[PDB]
Each structure stands twice: as structure tokens, then as C-alpha cells.
Design a protein around this ligand. Structure first.
Ligand SMILES: Nc1ncnc2c1ncn2[C@@H]1O[C@H](COP(=O)(O)OP(=O)(O)O)[C@@H](O)[C@H]1O
Ligand SMILES: Nc1ncnc2c1ncn2[C@@H]1O[C@H](COP(=O)(O)OP(=O)(O)O)[C@@H](O)[C@H]1O
Ligand SMILES: Nc1ncnc2c1ncn2[C@@H]1O[C@H](COP(=O)(O)OP(=O)(O)O)[C@@H](O)[C@H]1O
Lengths: 103, 110, 115
């Protein structure tokens, strides 16, 4: 399992949600954040961004990453980043069932 | 070490904090988030919206490898209702844990 | 790569921001959070009575860097965020397997793994 962490422009949230839902990735956690890098800033200098976290099976990562890149990109500085983090266990609170990679 | 990341119903925060404190797990970082999944969206269509991302609470607790199963069980027991939308717990590896005030760094090796 | 996750006092954000950009670490993601641990506070309030609170306001700073830059990033945050008092915060170092730049579609992975 992996956690796909995307930091995007806030106006791209609807595009990203749609692109993920279409491919069967309905579950996601969204956080309002701020950030900086190569951009700025007409500065402040921390601009509003949106963090989208999706925990998926190892084999779905490339599909999820590609779905987010395609829906969040503009080609301009400030599009954001996607960080892939290992997840050792994913537990569904209501059932107690836990998802692990067979290994 | 591991970071136990729980995404729960906001009204369960007090229950989760209590269940963790009683087992000796006092340290935690809490974030207000939104989410979607299996759970049905809120509507709310007032005349004269929508709201598909529901309010949730993220609880992050960094613990030793051997305490994970106890922390996970404490959160499942205190955050569950049995209804769609209870949330998830994700266990992420933590390689180093630094206490800013002392500069002391915890590292694991097995 | 690694994600350096620092949970600091909110008033230290500007110091941390400055100490990181000084060393060439311009990219960062900042989140407003709450927390608790060793530090206790307020426990002191105005109204004639009222003496509560639980989770104190904190700031999370996340910076994704190459493996060899971690110790420098950690030291820069420790130096700029410390007061010496309880509640200064923590730094957690988490592994990052892939780092994608959305605008170009270019993905950074660690060389030593297939594929
Ligand atoms: N090394 C990094 N660590 C953490 N977050 C980062 C990092 N670099 C960029 N970000 C995040 O991604 C957002 C966009 O980054 P930026 O460098 O300005 O975009 P881009 O590389 O597409 O031009 C930032 O506002 C910040 O939230
Ligand atoms: N794959 C996922 N990645 C990230 N967050 C998720 C994921 N699936 C669910 N969530 C989070 O858990 C919350 C509850 O998920 P939901 O599917 O509605 O119910 P349940 O936990 O009972 O399956 C969501 O609102 C979201 O915050
Ligand atoms: N085990 C932990 N897991 C997650 N967050 C923690 C943990 N311990 C501390 N924190 C975070 O760091 C902040 C400060 O921690 P605290 O123990 O009160 O003081 P100090 O960090 O100086 O030891 C907390 O308010 C919380 O946001």
C-alpha cells in the first residue's frame, strides 16, 4: 500500500476528484495548506494550495499519479508536487479489517 | 518508529484522545481535514449545495514499532460507530524522530 | 528522498522559513494544526472563572529533500525553532519513494530499485 500525497492549485480540486472517481478511486482526504517553491506572488509569500491524500494498493500508484498529473497540470510554475509514501497497514475503522501488502 | 495516522469523525476526537491518554499515549498532532468515500454526501439543498467533501479530523501519533497494534486497537475501539464514514488508520514508517528543544534524535535499528 | 515533517510553535514559522531558504531549501508545504504532549498550558483564562483548553495551536512544515540533505534540513529547523522550553515540537523523517513535479510530469525515484 502507498499514500499518494498531491499538493495542487486549489481550483484543480474538482478536476482531480473527477479524474480519481472515474478510475474507481473514490476515497480521499483533503487538507487546506499553504506553500512556496518556484512561483511568487503579486509577495506573501506562502500561497494557498490543496493537499489531496489517497491511499492505494502498490499496483495502482502509477495510474493514480498519472490521473492527478493530467488533471492538475497547467504547465506553469506552481502546479505542485506528488509524493509517494509507503503505508504498511491500512485499517478500516468500522470493520477493523486491515489491508497489508502480501510480502 | 511508526506514525499512526487516523482520519475520524470530528465528534470522536475526545473519545480517541481519552483512549490514547489512558494507555500512556499523550503526544499527538491534530488537523482539521475533509474527505469522501463510501459514506453518502450531505444535502442540504436550501431554497432560496451539494457538500460532497465531509468534515473529518486527522490524528497523528508517532510511536515505537511494538506499540502500533495497541494504538491502532485503541483508536478503532474509540472511533467506531459501525456506520459508513468511520474513517481509516494508516501506518507510515518514521526513520528518525527529533525533539527540537533538546536536539535528541531517536533512530530505530533491527 | 525523505519528507522532513516539523511540528513547531506558530511564531517560529518565519524563523524556520528564513533558515531553510538561506540553505537553498525554498520548497515547503505548511499546515495549521493542533497538538499536545509534554507541554501544558492555559490552565489560565479571563472571565472571572474558566480554566480549560487541551490542544495548543502548532504549525506543521513539510519539506521533501534528497537523503543527503536531511541532516542539514533537520539542523536548520532545530536551530531556528528552538526556545529551550517544553512545547518546541518534533521533527519526523518519513521515506518518500517517488516525487513528481506536476508541470513536467518528471518523477524522481531512488536508483537501487527495479523498475
Ligand atoms: N520540496 C518540497 N517539499 C514540500 N512541499 C513542496 C516542495 N516543493 C514544492 N512544494 C509544494 O508544492 C507547491 C508548488 O511548488 P512549486 O515549486 O512553486 O511548483 P512547481 O515546481 O510546479 O513550479 C508549493 O507551494 C508547496 O506547497
Ligand atoms: N483511500 C483513502 N485515502 C485517503 N483517505 C481515505 C481513503 N478512503 C477513505 N478515506 C478517508 O476516510 C473517510 C471515511 O471514508 P469512507 O469511505 O466514507 O467510510 P469508511 O471509512 O467507513 O470506509 C473519508 O471521508 C476520507 O477522509
Ligand atoms: N508522539 C507524538 N506524535 C505526534 N505528534 C507529537 C508527538 N509528540 C509531540 N507531538 C507534537 O509536538 C508538539 C509539542 O510536543 P510536546 O511533547 O508538548 O513538547 P516537546 O516537543 O518540547 O517535547 C505537540 O503539541 C504535538 O503537535
Amino acid at each position: 500500500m502507498k499514500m499518494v500525497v498531491a499538493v495542487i492549485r486549489p481550483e484543480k480540486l474538482e478536476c482531480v476528484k473527477k479524474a480519481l472517481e472515474e478510475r474507481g478511486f473514490v476515497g480521499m482526504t483533503v487538507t487546506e495548506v499553504k506553500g512556496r517553491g518556484e512561483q511568487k506572488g503579486i509577495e506573501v509569500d506562502l500561497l494557498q494550495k490543496t493537499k489531496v491524500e489517497v491511499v492505494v494498493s502498490d499496483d495502482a500508484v502509477d495510474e493514480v499519479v498519472e490521473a492527478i498529473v493530467s488533471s492538475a497540470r497547467t504547465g506553469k510554475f506552481g502546479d505542485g508536487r506528488i509524493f509517494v509514501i509507503p503505508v504498511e497497514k491500512s485499517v478500516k475503522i468500522r470493520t477493523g479489517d486491515e489491508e497489508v501488502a502480501a510480502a
